[model samples]
Target: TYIDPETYEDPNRAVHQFAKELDASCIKIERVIGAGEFGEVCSGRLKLPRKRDVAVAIKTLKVGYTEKQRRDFLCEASIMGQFDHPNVVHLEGVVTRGKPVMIVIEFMENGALDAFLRKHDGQFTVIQLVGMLRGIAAGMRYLADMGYVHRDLAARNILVNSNLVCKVSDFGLPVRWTAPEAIQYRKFTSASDVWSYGIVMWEVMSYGERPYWDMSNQDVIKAIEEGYRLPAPMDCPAGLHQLMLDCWQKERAERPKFEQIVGILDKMIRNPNSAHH
Candidate 1:
């Protein structure tokens, strides 16, 4: 139930409306751990047959937003409930009522991706990055199989434990769809996940620097649309660099399916000097 100060935007007030439902006698919310752009994440404990001493990530909506904001938060919880992946954090449960709702999630002791990468000193050697690519690819492939997309995939949303394997996190869930013609208008898709994956590789290369560390989200999108992508530094293997570029292509149809991305990463792992012919 610990919250990372980096993941949240500010200190947040309790969502008492939703909290009223909890078993008041058994559980106690210790404190507000962190806040995000539009919500608060808190840590709490639950008594159980399992003796559950768990860290719950609680996300709540502040007053005075539009109906769309409410629906988006609601959707995040719903989508999270259905997601099943070893590399994705499990959503413990969600409670929605009145104005403020909460998304309770299983806590991670290691905290967010940023902190872990910083601890690694700016970058993993090519070998470590290779293993990471495989994990992210596998996770993305699994998400696609589950019929949801992570419209937002960035290094900040990726968490790595002691093993350095990437675990995707913070997906707004309970996803619903618009008409097929308007897929991007509402529900996320596999292709969107691909876009995020590419940026993640760049993050790995840059060692926790902001994606496009130089530009705004809008600029990054424009760059993608205009056929530009992250430029690989001299240290990056050429083949690996191309794999990332292929993923960031403007048209999703033009991108290699994730399986291909995994294959490329596997090849790189076995041939670290860019020597695989």
Candidate 2:
């Protein structure tokens, strides 16, 4: 079994075996920073041959792949590597050998944006909230224009740097567009990402509140299917409020285009406080 030291029971020098195959003993491996059923995420430094230590995120995929599973697993890396946006997490590199594939990525110190808002109690003013919304909209616009649909565009997937710039992270569930009719009927369109982006806008407007507010994903889906809408903004501008709601309409065709969102955000950023008063 692939053993994550803290999470796994059997410790058969599993990681060491793989590390040797990658010929990556030069870098130091730190303790696991995150763990899930799929695998564990660790923080480490890669020696850049220039004496300067560059931080990296070491993600190990859980070992349960057959002949075909590896292809499915690495497909995500392919998409993420191809994406070139300042807000999206860049795939520095990847190593695949046998089981336990490893993905090397850029390191962001602060964790998910969800936690950030929780800690701050969402005390952000209108400018800060609108600023974040602009960043997220820009990222979504980029993804859509590049023929990609971000199936999971939520606050938790966003990673913020010390400068407070929002970077869209985690493309594990993205759906890159291939055909003219890639996703229709609210199945998984770039428009669907636009819907999720509205949900993200909800997160920004509410200071990073999690969607559904403890409701199950299924429950929220059923409710939305029943024409139920997310709560209206308490102190948000009518235009922004209506835009968020429009992005989440049941019909994918009813959802606003990323270009439209970009235009709206551009207007907001120009004033920067239109949503406040």
Candidate 3:
């Protein structure tokens, strides 16, 4: 039987066995892309046996880290190795046997969804935005079915490919995007993820505008507790706004599941006219 990485006692060993170990020599680091929790994130190329070179995003584990830090860094790779979904970022492998341990994944040219949307603001059609949302929902649905609740679900965590295909990506706290329950009780569930999904919907609809318009986190939490929900983004379709409202239901039980959200988006995509109403 396969061990669930989330529950595995020795995550380091689990990742070593489960994730493909890539030779450090095969990776050609290009340049630093961004900073991550571990270390410098870089764009690089990987050359595999009898395979053409491929672009990959590499996350290096900073040197001189504690054993605990090493374990924590590799644990992400262990979890990522288990996921195989089109809308979920794909883990290529991990470079563990060498120094400056690295976790490599498929590179997204467009980068984070929020920034991508902001860069091309108003460039996408409503259906196109909904398509992006649908892809995110599908990814969440897949994770939910696996009994995994993405504690951090936001547009910033989603990566967009050059083709505009969005994939759920580092799986945070900016309270404006969190559910009331999650903020109040520290209780995180798929329902909380659904709540965050609603915020992501707003971000998509508003072309990556900041949620709550610069309101403090405490104020955002207070507003949610007071039953204040965000208004529809300018020009947002009625049906989509309704769906977002459904996701923001104060009662976690009242919130729609990712599966249902995907279904709703599917219908809207199938009949563009339905989205407007």
Which stretches in model 1 have alpha-carbon errors above 4 Å? Answer: 1-33, 60-71, 97-101, 173-188, 216-226, 274-277
Expressed as tens digits, the lDDT of each residue in 1-277 for candidate 2 is 2122223242223233322233365455687878733468888877665868768787777776563444444455555666678877766666666434776777877667777777776477766777777777777778777877677778878877666778787755322111112332345668777777787777777766667677765665566658776675566676787788788776679888888887887787688657443
Tens digits of per-residue lDDT for model 3 on 1-277? 3245657666677788768998888888998888998799999889977678988999998888987777888878887787899999999999786556999999998889999989998899988999999999999999888777788888989999888889998841168877888887988899999999999999999999999988888888777878889988988889999999999998899999999999999998899888876
Best candidate, lDDT-wise? 3
What's the CA RMSD for each of the models? 8.2, 8.2, 1.8
The C-alpha lDDT values of all candidates are 0.62, 0.66, 0.87
List candidate 2 segments past 4 Å from native: 1-23, 49-51, 62-69, 98-100, 173-186, 216-219, 233-235
Alpha-carbon error at 31 in model 1, in Å? 5.2
Task: Give each model a TM-score.
Answer: 0.71, 0.77, 0.95
lDDT score, candidate 1, position 215: 70
Off by over 4 Å in 3: 1-6
